[PDB]
Symmetry: D2
Subunit: 311 residues, 4 copies
C-alpha cells in the first residue's frame, strides 16, 4: 500500500490544524482543497516544511480542483457557510450535494467525515448524494463535546483528562444529551466521587451547562473553536486508518437504535479498517430517551428546512 | 532540572525491557544495577545504542555499586530470589532490608516502585526499611493484572484494548480480586454487552480464570512474563515523572480503606509529581469486601513468614 | 520537579500552533499571554480540551497580566508590530524593553526564545533589557530557514525530509547565508548527488532562491507562515526542556566567531538543560565569510534604527 | 488496507524485542514463528498485553507452522545456528533454503529483512531461494554498526546521538569499512571538530576499534547484543511500512556499484513503499575501495563454504 491520501474539503482554520496534526502523526499525504484561489497552496507549503521538524514524510498539497478527490482514502468535509442560522441550511445543502457528486465520481470507496454544521443534518445529506455505504460516513460530534465534559471533570478531580470517560449523544449542538449516569473516572462510576464529596451534583450541573455552551463561551472570549474540533476529527480518522477499533461517539445512520431509523444521530461506534464496524446502542432509560428524542426531532426540523429555498 | 535519574535495582529480564522502553520514551538517564558482575554494563551498552534509532538522549549505565543510588529520582526494584515458594520470603526480606538502607542513605527523596514477589509484602518491608513517606512508594500489581483482563475482553469484543477498563484489587497474585461490576467498554458498563449477548457470563468466567492464571499459562508455554510487567511499571513511572495524574491500580499503604490499616494492598491511586496524590477507595459491596479481606489475609500470612529464618 | 511552565508572550497565530504542539507533546503547562483582552483565554480554553485526544495533562491558561511570567521556565516572544518596515523598529524596541523588564523581575532564570522580527536585532535588545545570561536567550532563524531548504531538496531527491541536513547562517531574513558546501543527504555530501546528475546546480540555485523567498511566496498565495515557525520554535524549546542536546541553528550572542563580537547572529548551537551549551563556529571560507559579514552589517543597520523615534 | 502482517521467523531474544517495539509503535500484527514448540505462543501472549499500556491494537500471535507466512507484508529472519564459526555456514544455508521455499510459496510479495549471520552471505542465499525481486530483500548491517559509531562520538562531543551521522559499508562483521571521511556532527564535517581539538584523531581510532568490536565487548561483559539489533531492524521495517524513504545502510544486491556485481554488500539505500527505492553508491577513493574489496572478498569466501557439507 502507498500512504493514505487524506483530502480536506475546506482549508479554513480547522483544516489548517488537521493538516498540522496529520504531518505530526505521519498519517498520510494531505490535500488542502478549497474554493478560495491559492490560499490552500499557501497553507500547504507552510505545513509541508514541518515534515523536517516532525521526522515525517507526508506530502501536503493545495488544490482548487474537485477532481483531486480521485483516490482519496479519507475525505474530511469542513466546507460551508457559517455567517438567522437556519437560513444557511439550504445553501449548505447545495454544498453537500456538490461535494457528494464529486465523491461518487472520484472516490466512492473513501471514508468520509462531515463537520459542516448542523452536522447531524449535513452528514445525512452527504450520505444520500455521495452514495457511500452507511459504514463509510460519519459526522463529528461526541468526541468533541465529550472532550469538554471529560476535561472539565478531570480538572476538578485532579486526574489525567483521558481517565474521565463520558457519553454525549443524540446530536451535536444545543440539544446534545449529556448522560450523567455514563460518566466514569478511571473506570469508576462518577457517583462514587459524588458520594465522597469530591465533586458535587451542583458542580456537575455547572459543568454540564458549560459543556453545552463551550463554543459560545470561546466566541464570547473573542476566539473561536477550531483546535479541539481538529484534534477530535483526527482521532476519528486515525482510528480508521490504523484499524485501532476505538469506541468513539459519532453521528451515524440509525437503523432502529433508540427507536429511531432513517436519520443520523450521535452514538458510540467502533471505528476501524472497515469504517463503522459496530454501532453501540446505550441502554437508555425513559428520561434519557426522551432527551434523545428531542435531539432527533431538532435534526429533522432542520433537515426539512435544508431542502429548498423560498422567495 | 537535569533529566530524571532512574535506577533499576535488578538488571534481569524485566530490567532489560524497562531500560529499552525508557530510552524509547526518552524518560530519563538509566542505571542498570545488579549484584552480578559486568552483566549490567553489557546490557547497558547494548541499550545505549538505541538512542540513535529512537532520537533520544538518555544515558544508560551499568552498576555493581549500591552508592550509584545517589540522586535517583525513581528507583525500581526487581531484585530477589524466585527459585516451596514461602521459603524464599525471609531471603527476600533480607534483600529489601539491604536495598532500603541504601535508599535511606543515598536517595531518600526517590519515588520507589517494588516488583519483587510477593509484591504486597515486599513493598511494605521496603517502605519500613527505606524510611520514605507513604506517598513515595508503591508496588506493581493492578496495572499488570488488569492489562490481561482488559486485553482478553477487548479481543472478544473487537475493540481497542485500552477502551476496556477494569479493576483488580487487594493483592497481586492468586488472591487478586477481579471486580466484574467495575468493567466498562468505551466507558459503558460491561453488563450492557452481556445483555446484548455480545459476551456471555460464562465467557467472562473463563477470562477471569485466564487472568488469574496468566503467569502460569506463559510459563507452561516455555516462556516467562517480563514484557508486560516492564510496560506496566514504565506506565506507572512515567505518570510520576511527567505529572500525568493517571488513575492506576497499585499496591499502596492502606489507612482504613476497605476496613484495613497497617498493610499494603492493591487499589486505584492517582500518580503524579507528588507521588501517590490520591488513594481511591472503591465502594465495594460485602461480597467484594470478603474477597478483599482474603487477599489481605494472605499478604499478612506471608509477611509473618518473611521476618525470620528457622533451623 | 513540577512540570515546566511555558509562557507564550503573544497569542497570535504562531502562539496558537505552539500551544497545540506543546499539548500534543505533553511538554509543560502553557500560558497564552497577550495584551488583547480575553482572546488568549478563548484560545487557551479551546486548546485545553485537546489534552483528552492527546492523552496529555498540560494546563493551558490565558493571561492579560505580565506578572504571570512568574516562575516561567521557558518564555517565547512573538509579540510585536508587523504592519516602510524599518519604521516599526523603534516600536518593537519598546516592546522588547517592556517584556525584558518583566522577565528580569518575574523569571530571571527562564530560557528565552525571541521570534519578533527582525529577530537578530530583537533578540539582542531583549537580552540587554532582560539581564539574562548569554546562554539563556536565543532567536528563531536557522531551524526555520533550513527546514525549507532541506524539505525542497528532499522532494527532489525522493528521500525522507529530515535526512537532508543544511546550514543557513548569519541572519534570519533576506541576507541569510545559504551554505551549499554544508548540505548533505543521508550524511553524504550533496556534491556526490550533483556529480551523479540526480540534482543539478541550476536546480539548487532555484531552490536557494525559493528558500530565501518562502515567506513572500506564502503571503503571495494569500496565506501566511505560522505553522512551520511554530514547529521550529517547539523543536528548540523541547531540546532545552528534555536536555536532548540537538545541534540547531539559532541566533546567539557572538563572542569572536566569524570575526564578530557584540552582536547576535545565526550559527549552529547545542541546546540542552544548560541552555546554549555550545556555540559551533563553522570553518567558513572567505567567500562565505563575506556573505556572513553582509548579514551582520544589515542586523547592525536595523539595530541602530531601533533605538529612537524621530519627529 | 488492513494492518500490515509482520512475521518474525525466529522468536529468540531479538524477536522478542522486535515484537515489543512493533506494538509500542503500533506498526502491524505480529507473528512470532519458531521451530521451538510453544515458546513463541508464550512470548506472544506476554507481548500482547502491552497493547493496553501502549494504546495500540496489534495482534501478537505465536506460530510453529511455516504456512502462517501466508499474506505476510514483512518477514524478518533471525533463525539460525550461532553455536569454528565457518562450520555453521552450510547448516545455516539449509535454514535459508527452507525459509526461502516457504516465502516463495506463501508470501512472494513480502519485503524480507535477513539478520542471520553472516548476514551478507545469508541474505543472498535467501534472495536466491525465495525468488523475491532485488528491491524486496535486504540484510541488517549498517544501521546497527553505525548506531554504535554515532553513539560513541555523540557522547564524546556532548550532542544528541542522532545528530552524528556516519557510514560503515561493505559487510556487517569484522571486515566492516568505517569511513572517517563521511562522519558529520549536526551536518558539519567531523574534521572541523578535530581541527578545533574537540575530538582527536587518536580518540577516533579508539572509537573505530570499539565499534568493530562492540558485539565482542558486550559478550565479554556477560551480556549479548539484542536490543540495538532489534531497534535497527525495526527502523528499517518502519521505513518500508510507512514509506518514510529514509537513507539507511543495509546489505543489498550490488549491480556494479564499487566495481562489484552478483554479491550483496552494505551501502546506503532509500527504503520506502517500493522496498529498496534507490541504491546510493558513495564516491569512495582508492584507499576506501580497497577496504570495500576486502569486505566483499570475505563475504565470497564464506558464501563458497555455505553450499556444501564435507565428510
Amino acid at each position: 500500500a502507498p500512504k493514505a491520501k487524506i483530502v480536506l474539503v475546506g482549508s479554513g482554520m480547522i483544516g489548517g490544524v488537521m493538516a498540522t496534526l496529520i504531518v505530526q502523526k505521519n498519517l498520510g499525504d494531505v490535500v488542502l482543497f478549497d474554493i478560495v484561489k491559492n490560499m490552500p497552496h499557501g497553507k500547504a507549503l507552510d505545513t509541508s516544511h514541518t515534515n523536517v521538524m516532525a521526522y515525517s514524510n507526508c506530502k501536503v498539497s493545495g488544490s482548487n480542483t474537485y477532481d483531486d478527490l480521485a483516490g482519496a482514502d479519507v475525505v474530511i468535509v469542513t466546507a460551508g457557510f457559517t455567517k438567522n442560522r437556519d437560513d444557511l441550511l439550504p445553501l449548505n445543502n447545495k454544498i453537500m450535494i456538490e461535494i457528494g457528486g464529486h465523491i461518487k465520481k472520484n472516490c466512492p470507496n473513501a471514508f468520509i467525515i462531515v463537520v459542516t454544521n448542523p452536522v447531524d443534518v449535513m452528514v445525512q445529506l452527504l450520505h444520500q448524494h455521495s452514495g457511500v455505504p452507511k459504514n463509510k460516513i460519519i459526522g463529528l460530534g461526541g468526541v468533541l463535546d465529550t472532550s469538554r465534559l471529560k476535561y472539565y471533570i478531570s480538572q476538578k478531580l485532579n486526574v489525567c483528562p483521558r481517565d474521565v470517560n463520558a457519553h454525549i449523544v443524540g446530536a451535536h449542538g444545543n440539544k446534545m444529551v449529556l448522560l450523567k449516569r455514563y460518566i466514569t473516572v478511571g473506570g469508576i462510576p462518577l457517583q462514587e466521587f459524588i458520594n465522597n464529596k469530591l465533586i458535587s451534583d451542583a458542580e456537575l450541573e455547572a459543568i454540564f451547562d458549560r459543556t453545552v455552551n463551550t463554543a459560545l463561551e470561546i466566541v464570547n472570549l473573542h476566539a473561536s473553536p477550531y483546535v479541539a474540533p481538529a484534534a477530535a476529527i483526527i482521532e476519528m480518522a486515525e482510528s480508521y486508518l490504523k484499524d485501532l477499533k476505538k469506541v468513539l461517539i459519532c453521528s451515524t445512520l440509525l437503523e432502529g437504535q433508540y427507536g429511531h431509523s432513517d436519520i443520523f444521530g450521535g452514538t458510540p461506534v467502533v471505528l476501524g479498517a472497515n469504517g463503522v464496524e459496530q454501532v453501540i446502542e446505550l441502554q437508555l432509560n425513559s428520561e434519557e430517551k426522551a432527551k434523545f428524542d428531542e435531539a432527533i426531532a431538532e435534526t429533522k426540523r432542520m433537515k426539512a428546512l435544508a431542502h429548498h429555498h423560498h422567495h
